[PDB]
Design a protein around this ligand. Sequence first.
Ligand SMILES: Nc1ncnc2c1ncn2[C@@H]1O[C@H](COP(=O)(O)O)[C@@H](O)[C@H]1O
Ligand SMILES: Nc1ncnc2c1ncn2[C@@H]1O[C@H](COP(=O)(O)O)[C@@H](O)[C@H]1O
Ligand SMILES: [Ca+2]
Ligand SMILES: [Ca+2]
Lengths: 173, 174
Amino acid sequence: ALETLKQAIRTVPDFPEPGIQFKDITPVLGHPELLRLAIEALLEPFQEQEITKVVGIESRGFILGGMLAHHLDAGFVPVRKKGKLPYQTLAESYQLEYGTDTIEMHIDAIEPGDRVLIHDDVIATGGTAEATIRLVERAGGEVVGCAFLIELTGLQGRKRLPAHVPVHTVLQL
Amino acid sequence: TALETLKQAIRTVPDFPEPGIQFKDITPVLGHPELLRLAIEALLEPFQEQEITKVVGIESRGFILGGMLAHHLDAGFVPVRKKGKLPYQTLAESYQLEYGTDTIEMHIDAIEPGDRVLIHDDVIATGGTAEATIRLVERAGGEVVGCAFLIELTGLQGRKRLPAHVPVHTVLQL
Ligand SMILES: Nc1ncnc2c1ncn2[C@@H]1O[C@H](COP(=O)(O)O)[C@@H](O)[C@H]1O
Ligand SMILES: Nc1ncnc2c1ncn2[C@@H]1O[C@H](COP(=O)(O)O)[C@@H](O)[C@H]1O
Ligand SMILES: [Ca+2]
Ligand SMILES: [Ca+2]
């Protein structure tokens, strides 16, 4: 039971765009007792597993993503929306409900043989996490798993991800 | 000399984001577990025993080491962001650039009186953003125990822009 985490999550409708039922985890981030619980819960299924790199998906995935890398004595790799990373990148474009998005990762972020944990605060449709798995694999990384704080269960983002990747979600909202 | 290895790993990318800007890319430090460990240890050396309750990370690139600093210190983490980028109710600080103005924001429930706050960003350049961040934190009632930056662009003299009562620690001078 992780009720203290669940209770702390704020919903802000229409952020950053109308229609999005935004799950704001800043109340968790700001309280060390809850931050501790969140990190422990994210990491639990990955005990005693060699993790070389943690990928944090975009700005809000950098926050717990970095902590995970530090806690695991791993490197940290940012994956970003197109145009945000400074060095040469690999890119993946993907179809949305409406429109398309592109994410990128530095060409030297991941090396063949790296064991990689992919993190984001929230999985919604799973489109971004799917494309991130593709980036990591193109670089020769092996995806040990994805760890999300929150799954938006209604959207069934898990179904968008490939069968071969273990997916851990702490909260089902 | 461990620090010289950090220095050598920093990458400069010309003309990013806007032409003319000499971007300091810290991803080679972030990606290598040994360098990342050294970076965090160096940032925290003056601060480990200071009863810090909150670490502020300034914008996306400050969230990366910023979160690790909070986690390491058993402190809470607070994101500060450009205007409109945070979801909850905010307080805001506008500040002057060389051309025009910028505005940063923080959640109204992020910082309380009594909080002892460390402010982090990967790079300090003009110091405009960190100056405004100090103002935000202070208006919320926090005390800024210090700022910790990985990189100081000493040519831009950002230190001079920060108020004299706030200790400023930088790991690398570039
Ligand atoms: N309701 C939401 N609350 C917070 N973050 C969200 C929400 N929906 C999507 N995101 C984020 O937006 C990006 C797109 O998510 P996805 O639909 O899973 O590809 C990911 O970084 C998600 O974490
Ligand atoms: N040359 C640079 N390389 C990387 N980041 C930078 C550089 N110059 C400024 N920044 C970032 O841009 C923002 C504005 O910096 P400042 O001029 O110190 O207010 C801060 O988040 C800095 O970390
Ligand atoms: Ca360790
Ligand atoms: Ca707002």
